[PDB]
């Protein structure tokens, strides 16, 4: 069908200019609209009819449309501009609305921070129920993006991993957790297990061993 394509993520330093693009076949003929969405809130209209600003929207937001690409420009981005941005338009007929996939705008404004990682072995109570859940807790990282992998005796763990998305802490850093669900027999069948947390191109690994 018809689609509006946005970059999944854009990063900007405070005071710099961010540009969020939105590609669509019918944009040369149709108006684009831009919505800002912050967590637990309804979307807010930022730009309408390609380039118009509603009353009260900060001057730094501007819109344009050239060819099949609409662009939201945020001049001098502020930390309060950190949000998801959605473009919106119609199909070529004009009868159906359509959203882009959204762009997560990260406004940095604090130094990179490596994650603190704590890995817990299974409790004896859970083991006596023939289950073993490994708990990998990840905190105080910035920016809010991590990748988590698990290993058993150096080999990849291909199933049983459940990992949260990052969540903002009160200090504006991020937290996440990852869980590896095993049986008691699986836990006791290996010499060690590791939780591997990759952040900004580097990795911290924590290991536990049946004792």
């Amino acid at each position: 069908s018809y689609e509006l394509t946005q970059p999944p993520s854009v990063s900007v330093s405070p005071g710099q200019t961010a540009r969020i693009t939105c590609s669509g076949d019918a944009l040369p003929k149709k108006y684009a609209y831009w919505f800002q969405q912050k967590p637990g809130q309804s979307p807010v209209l930022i730009i309408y009819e390609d380039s118009k600003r509603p009353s009260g929207i900060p001057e730094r937001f501007s819109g344009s449309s050239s060819g099949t690409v609409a662009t939201l420009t945020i001049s001098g981005a502020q930390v309060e501009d950190e949000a998801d941005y959605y473009c919106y338009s119609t199909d070529s007929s004009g009868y159906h609305g359509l959203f882009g996939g959204g762009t997560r705008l990260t406004v940095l404004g604090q130094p990179k921070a490596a994650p603190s990682v704590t890995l817990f072995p299974p409790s004896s109570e859970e083991l006596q129920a023939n289950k073993a859940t490994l708990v990998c807790l990840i905190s105080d990282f910035y920016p809010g993006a991590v990748e988590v992998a698990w290993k058993a005796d150096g080999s990849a763990v291909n199933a049983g991993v459940e990992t949260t998305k990052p969540s903002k802490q009160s200090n504006n850093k991020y937290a996440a957790s990852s869980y590896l669900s095993l049986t008691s027999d699986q836990w006791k069948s290996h010499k060690s297990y590791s939780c591997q947390v990759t952040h900004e191109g580097s990795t911290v690994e924590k290991t536990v061993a049946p004792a």
Binding site: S1, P43, G97, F120, E162, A176
Partner: protein
């Protein structure tokens, strides 16, 4: 002022029917289209469809056409969105929106309604203690809050008397449909032997609270 008031949060099972509502005020209800927009957890906004209350005309996105029904009752200025048989992937926040003058323009939004579609039954958590293996000035203790449904759960330590250094993590949603979370606290190892540590785990949806001693 234009106001859109939506019905309350819903927890349904796959295959069940559901009808949610959007009651408007502050403008001529039959003079503007009403759009419905949804957002699955952690996903993007999706335009579902719209209705013209002046003549019952409906338009649907190709992704939703024939799978949901939009309707309206002008007598009470209310629009509706309904399913005869929900899918699990229909878990989403659903917004109604008064349209503007241009077709499909979105003018005023409702606050949204949270709809959870899950096969999981309501279940209180199993709470397990988290301790390090048997160095020594402090120690990290915690509680694993395993396999509960639905959200939310709250956690305190020592009945709320212990707050310094407590980190309670948001839950993971498992493929089973059940949730799990953990809470951890760093304590002095001098206290380990004279200070008891108990995590208080409250799950109002199942009317269950667990106070787990961690040694």
């Amino acid at each position: 002022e234009v106001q859109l008031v939506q019905s309350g949060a819903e927890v349904k099972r796959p295959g069940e029917s559901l009808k949610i509502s959007c009651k408007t005020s502050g403008y001529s209800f039959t003079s503007y289209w009403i759009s419905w927009v949804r957002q699955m957890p952690g996903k993007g906004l999706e335009w579902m469809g719209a209705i013209d209350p002046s003549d019952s005309d409906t338009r649907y996105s190709p992704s939703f056409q024939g799978q949901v029904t939009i309707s309206a009752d002008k007598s009470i200025s209310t629009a509706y969105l309904q399913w005869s048989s929900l899918k699990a992937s229909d878990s989403a926040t659903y917004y109604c929106a008064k349209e503007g003058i241009a077709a499909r323009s979105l003018d005023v939004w409702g606050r949204g309604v949270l709809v959870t579609v899950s096969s999981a039954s309501t279940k209180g958590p199993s709470v397990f203690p988290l301790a390090p293996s048997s160095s020594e000035s402090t120690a990290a203790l915690g509680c694993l809050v395993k396999d509960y449904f639905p959200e939310p759960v709250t956690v305190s330590w020592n009945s709320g008397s212990l707050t310094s250094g407590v980190h309670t993590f948001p839950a993971v949603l498992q493929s089973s449909g059940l949730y799990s979370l953990s809470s951890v606290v760093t304590v002095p190892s001098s206290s380990l032997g004279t200070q008891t540590y108990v995590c208080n785990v409250n799950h109002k949806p199942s009317n269950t609270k667990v106070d787990k001693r961690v040694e």
